[PDB]
Structure 1
């Protein structure tokens, strides 16, 4: 059932931004995200 497949890679999910001259998006909820970074 499970096997190695060959396919064209995806660079990200498609998301078309609905542009409008009388509309804006303002966030109402925030999430404090903690990310790591490792450098020698």
Structure 2
């Protein structure tokens, strides 16, 4: 049975906050298709040939 994710319990209380003291510059990749192969079909040659 696949695990959804690691279990994390957030330490919520009514008067406590968590403030970051540092940062990470993260570069991530996103690959998106833009175009396809442009195809032309000769209908007469495909169906009947010569």
TM-score band, normalised by shorter chain: 0.7 to 0.9
Tell me by how many angstroms 1:9 deviates.
0.4
Count of residues in Structure 1 that have an aligned counterpart in Structure 2: 33
The structure with the greater share of residues assigned to helix is 2
Which is higher, the Rg of structure 1 or of structure 2? 2
Name the Cα RMSD after superposition: 0.5
Does residue 17 of the first structure (1) align with residue 18 of the second (2)? no
Q: Could you list the structure 1 runs, at least 4 aligned residues long, displaced by more than 4 angstroms after superposition.
A: none
1:10-38 Cα offsets, whole Å, 9 max, x none, are: 01000011110110000001000000000
TM-score, normalization by structure 2: 0.63
Structure 1 residues not aligned, in runs of 5+: 1-7
Stretches of structure 2 lacking an aligned partner (at least 5 in a row): 34-50
Q: More strand by proportion, 1 or 2? A: 2
Distance 1:15 1:36 in 2: 26
